[PDB]
Amino acid sequence: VRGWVFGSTMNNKSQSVIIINNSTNVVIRACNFE
Amino acid sequence: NYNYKYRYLRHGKLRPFERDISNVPFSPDGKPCTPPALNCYWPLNDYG
Numbered sequence: 001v002r003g004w005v006f007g008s009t010m011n012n013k014s015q016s017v018i019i020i021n022n023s024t025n026v027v028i029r030a031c032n033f034e
Numbered sequence: 035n036y037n038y039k040y041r042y043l044r045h046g047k048l049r050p051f052e053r054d055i056s057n058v059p060f061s062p063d064g065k066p067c068t069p070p071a072l073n074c075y076w077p078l079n080d081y082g
Binding site: 009013014015 | 058
């Protein structure tokens with residue numbers, strides 16, 4: 001288990017930092033929604 | 035040329051380098067409006 005969700009006021013209302021490792025190659029995005 | 039707007043309504047001050055983006059109409063006590071309801075503005079204005 002390695003997944004990380006951060007933000008405020010979910011479901012298409014504000015940005016969100018997400019941290020998910022992709023085979024020891026850590027993918028980190030900061031704009032996704034729901 | 036009114037392509038440049040500003041936000042002027044928020045519950046509370048900002049933190050340093052806090053970034054506010056979301057566009058929801060305002061009411062001073064929670065309670066989400068729907069314009070043209072009374073005392074429910076838009077959270078943006080133009081420069082002039």
